[PDB]
Motif scaffolding. Structure first.
Motif, PDB file in Angstrom:
ATOM      1  N   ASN A   1       0.823  -1.205   0.000  1.00 24.22           N
ATOM      2  CA  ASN A   1       0.000   0.000   0.000  1.00 24.22           C
ATOM      3  C   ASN A   1       0.859   1.257   0.000  1.00 24.22           C
ATOM      4  N   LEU A   2       1.991   1.223   0.704  1.00 28.09           N
ATOM      5  CA  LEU A   2       2.874   2.385   0.757  1.00 28.09           C
ATOM      6  C   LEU A   2       3.494   2.674  -0.603  1.00 28.09           C
ATOM      7  N   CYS A   3       3.838   1.626  -1.352  1.00 30.12           N
ATOM      8  CA  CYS A   3       4.389   1.812  -2.687  1.00 30.12           C
ATOM      9  C   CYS A   3       3.352   2.399  -3.638  1.00 30.12           C
TER      10      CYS A   3
ATOM     11  N   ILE B   1       0.832   4.370  -2.808  1.00 29.73           N
ATOM     12  CA  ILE B   1       0.699   5.776  -2.448  1.00 29.73           C
ATOM     13  C   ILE B   1       1.938   6.554  -2.866  1.00 29.73           C
TER      14      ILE B   1
END
Lengths: 95, 111, 140, 119, 82, 97, 83, 108, 96
Positions: B85-87, B89
């Motif tokens: 999810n961080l990638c 975003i």
DNA sequence: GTTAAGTGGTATTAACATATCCTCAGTGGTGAGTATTAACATGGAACTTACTCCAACAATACAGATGCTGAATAAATGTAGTCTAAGTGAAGAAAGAAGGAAAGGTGGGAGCTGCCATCACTCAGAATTGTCCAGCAGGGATTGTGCAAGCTTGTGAATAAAGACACATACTTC
DNA sequence: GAAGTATGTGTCTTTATTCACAAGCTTGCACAATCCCTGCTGGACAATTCTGAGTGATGGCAGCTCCCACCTTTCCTTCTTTCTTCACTTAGACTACATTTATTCAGCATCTGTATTGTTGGAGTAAGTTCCATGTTAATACTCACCACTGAGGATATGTTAATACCACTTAAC
């Protein structure tokens, strides 16, 4: 059945100190038993190799103190070192 | 330029529909409050036995052995979706794509 | 005679073409200026479409608008791609000039130059304003 | 022979000093084990247990529960900056995750401006 | 067609639930096939080590401790199973 | 005069530094930084020559490996410029944040 | 008795650029150098703190190569070539 | 008395079985150490050593060098898929990195 | 005279002279190879030490070492390392 | 003397400042509608408490290995100074990369329906694991012996360093 | 798009540099031989726990239809980073000496293991009980589409007055 030892009664003794009106589930105590076992091997493993590095045959409270400083993160390390030396001071003074 | 259209619309009766993301955000809150296993136990148990056939035949499994595998498996996948999810975003998206999984796994040291 | 009703019909159709073509009255004045050179202000177009201007002025602006409506229908992009400058008088200048009246109704040019330099107004502006002051004071 | 006293009671510890000594001796850590090593280790182990149980007991009170479950142990560990570093590679079964939604995924609050309009 | 490959028993709703607990709001349609491949690699590594502990002990059943030992050997210590 | 385009020399530096094995930080500025950091832990500390050298080999290996992760985060975001947000993401996924 | 300060600035921008080149970086933002200096300081603080811990346990006053090697190994960063 | 034969010669090894036995005994690993454990361990250590030295000598020859330096060990380990996995979290001093440039950074 | 310090330098060199008879090695690469052998020694012996503890065994045998090799070395490395280890024990047993 | 230009005098004209109004964008307020939360009663299972018993811990003595303190000292790191060139810092011009805006389209979400595969439960059997007991051989302990390995010197081959030549690529021009 | 030009990297040669390899010495540790004993093995047997099968109920999944918000592409602006140059500032090297420290003995203090005995703390099993999950209900809070209100900027209508324009009178030129 053969006897299987665990830290369950000691974790419950500590729990009744910090939180008298609080119980613990058997699944949580299984986790808390694993935590004490895991941390025991981490400290004893680090203390074991500290003696090997320094060519010592004995694991003393100094090896345990250094292993606590190496493994615990900061505020935990200095509080646990304070607790450990306080117990060794009480143990020696008693007998 | 002349870019015009007809904004005609109307409504008499329409079953209630949530916008694309209201239910998804509701599901995130629901499954982050809960602690149960999110994979069905029997389908997962069959997968574990199928994989173990490659290593040894006629292998037996304790009930807690398969449960220990499931707890570790979903913990690994939930934590991987947090890195994935961080990638997404980071790349200015809200949709996780297979390249986000590959980037997250590569940085971790699994690729 | 019937020129009144013919102008009125032309003006109604003119309003319809202006609304259909998507041109504002200021834009109409700009187009008239860039196609003839005599740019007109949007107040004149308003008074036209509402039929407020005088009859002579009515006839005078009939042909220009006829030509514009008969010409602009072909292409608008290239067309899209000389006012009667009317300086205003601010209130303190108006009061000072009124003070300059009540003593010398018709000053000489020698005094007019001094008045113009005193209040920072153009000589022609002050002369025409003086003439119109006399004009409206002689109305009554 | 004098009356027996546990080494835990001498040090004032709830955790077993005599058992920690035995686990050190038979754990193949060193050829010899000092008298203060089990006392120091038991006191450190007891302190860490109290730290987790203090935070986990606080968690149980927030959920209006009078019994710690694995969820409260996970909440206690992951909400403490230092217990989370100690247990960073540890998975707590039936513990779940910390409730945390990235702020970019939350819905756009009501607001509207106006760009250039030619209609 | 009905699901044939066992890996297919890790259904798309199951993977969506794992992403929701991971805070994922929108999921591409190619994630599920990628996620099934990722889980199969993770399970192969753990099960191979769990069986290695089992055959060393000269047992036929995989116990919970073998899984716990295999997970610990990979730096993925799991609490609550012994 | 002769001017290379903005990126031709950079690619030339990439090839020469990936072909060599020497330490890319100056030894004295790093040694002074090592002694400054150690002052927070123990006053009047001595260092072996190889103790500082071991710290530099590990420090530069750590930083080079982090820039490889940082570069992949930049390319993931459809960039060729590494930004501080890329270092933060690489270190967060690694488990350092 | 000597004291030091302002030495992270001795890790110069050209030196950081060389490390990015060996990392395969073609173009570097202007704020990377400050971010890199903080990253190195955090890394060096962790390794040196463990290295001094090994040193003071040995009742020594000089930090040896082994203390650094032991400290790096404890962080999962085994280093070959120094003992 | 019989003339001594090293346990390495009995097993046909180059690594020292006798020294590996002593290190196992004095390393605090178990109460007792079997007779075949040092033989098995020295054989595994000798194999892993020959694996790296074979790949490193090839990399030394590919650079027209007749002497292995840390760069060749780095090249050998990182260019072998399994050795790179064994030594994944290991830093080799004075070894550098592999010459890898991303394809999106190359000129059109 | 300085104290004696044991290393695998003479054994790594002997292994080198079989795979590459004409190739030498620098002292820095020899130091790296010595660290590699010591690091792998602690991994295998440490893993084998845990296997004895798990199974309540007081002895480390070639069976504990073989299981440690399979647990640590990946894929084709483990298969060949087990083959070399088994071949040496078989040869050692047949000798004496 | 007659005729065209300048001077006023008064009528028309058209643009300015501000007064209204059209239309479109932003709020938001709003009920319906759905979902989450809180209260409350209840059963059960999961916890806590109270008993055997037995294995592990403590008390006691003592031997011997381990660590301590002081002395002397060699080894090693620190400190300062000198000099030279390699590297850094600042600046300036400009290429091109980053980022915003806009548009389009398509892929993912929300919801609906039908059904089948999961789940909870039970049972029967057999495969596996645990326990107990004998026993014996593999491993530790010991001592004596010698030879392998480490340390200390010493030198020829490998590598680095110019130095010139030959590309190979890049970048501007035609 | 080639030709041409300038820059950089690679290649072969020669020469000095250095560093690895071998010979020579001693020391400590590996082996050989021996004895002792306990950990590990094999067998038998109870028992326990996992696999395979059957069953019923229902909820979760699979497939489907919209449709819209998100991703991707294109285009354009800007401003950040690169490449180059030049002055200068430390890093690198290297001596030389000062200062600290780590090592080594030596004697002695003391701490830990080992053995034996006696008990008591802790594990297992059983009764005793109360917290929590489950249900039903109600209340609260959130979402979403519809209705409406109103303010802003541009665009029209007014009041009003600069500005010009038309006309009668006089005045200058041939």
């Amino acid at each position: 059945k053969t006897r299987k030892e665990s830290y369950a009664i000691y974790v419950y003794k500590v729990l009744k100190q910090v939180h008298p009106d609080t119980g613990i589930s058997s699944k949580a105590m299984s986790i808390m038993n694993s935590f004490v076992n895991d941390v025991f091997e981490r400290i004893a493993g680090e203390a074991s190799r500290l003696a090997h590095y320094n060519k010592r045959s004995t694991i003393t409270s100094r090896e345990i103190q250094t292993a606590v400083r190496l493994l615990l993160p900061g505020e935990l390390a200095k509080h646990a070192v304070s607790e450990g030396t306080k117990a060794v001071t009480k143990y020696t003074s008693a007998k | 330029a002349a870019r015009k259209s007809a904004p005609a619309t109307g409504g008499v009766k329409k079953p209630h529909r949530y916008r694309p993301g209201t239910v998804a955000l509701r599901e995130i809150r629901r499954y982050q409050k809960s602690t149960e296993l999110l994979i069905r136990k029997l389908p997962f148990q069959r997968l574990v036995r199928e994989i173990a056939q490659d290593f040894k035949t006629d292998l037996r499994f304790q009930s807690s052995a398969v449960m220990a595998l499931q707890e570790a498996s979903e913990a690994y996948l939930v934590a991987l979706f947090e890195d994935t999810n961080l990638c997404a975003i980071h790349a200015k998206r809200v949709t996780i794509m297979p390249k986000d999984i590959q980037l997250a796994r590569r940085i971790r040291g699994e690729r | 005679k019937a020129l009144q009703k013919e102008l009125e019909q032309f003006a109604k159709l003119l309003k319809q073409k202006r609304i259909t073509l998507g041109y504002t009255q200021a834009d109409v004045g700009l187009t008239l200026g860039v196609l003839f050179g005599k740019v007109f202000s949007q107040t004149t177009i308003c008074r036209f479409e509402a039929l407020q201007l005088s009859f002579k002025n009515m006839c005078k602006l009939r042909p220009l608008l006829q030509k514009w409506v008969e010409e602009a229908d072909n292409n608008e992009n290239l067309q899209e791609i000389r006012k009667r400058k009317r300086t205003s008088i601010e209130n303190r200048v108006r009061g000072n000039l009124e003070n300059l009246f009540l003593q010398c109704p018709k000053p000489t040019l020698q005094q007019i130059s001094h008045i113009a330099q005193q209040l920072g107004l153009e000589k022609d502006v002050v002369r025409v304003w003086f003439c119109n002051r006399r004009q409206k004071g002689k109305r009554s | 022979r004098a009356k027996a006293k546990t080494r835990s009671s001498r040090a004032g510890l709830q955790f077993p000093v005599g058992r920690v000594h035995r686990l050190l001796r038979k754990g193949n850590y060193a050829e010899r084990v000092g008298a203060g090593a089990p006392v120091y280790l038991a006191a450190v182990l007891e302190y860490l247990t109290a730290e987790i149980l203090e935070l986990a007991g606080n968690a149980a009170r927030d959920n209006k529960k009078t019994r710690i479950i694995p969820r409260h142990l996970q909440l206690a560990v992951r909400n403490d900056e230092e217990l989370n570093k100690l247990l960073g590679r540890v998975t707590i079964a039936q513990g779940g995750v910390l409730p945390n939604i990235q702020s970019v995924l939350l819905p756009k609050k009501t607001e509207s401006s106006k760009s250039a309009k030619s209609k | 067609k009905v699901l044939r490959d066992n890996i297919q028993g890790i259904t798309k709703p199951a993977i969506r639930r794992l992403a929701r607990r991971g805070g994922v709001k929108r999921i591409s349609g190619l994630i599920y096939e990628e996620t099934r491949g990722v889980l199969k690699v993770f399970l192969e590594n753990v099960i191979r080590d769990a069986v290695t502990y089992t055959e060393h002990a000269k047992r036929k059943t995989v116990t919970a401790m073998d899984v716990v030992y295999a997970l610990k050997r990979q730096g993925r210590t799991l609490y609550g199973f012994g």
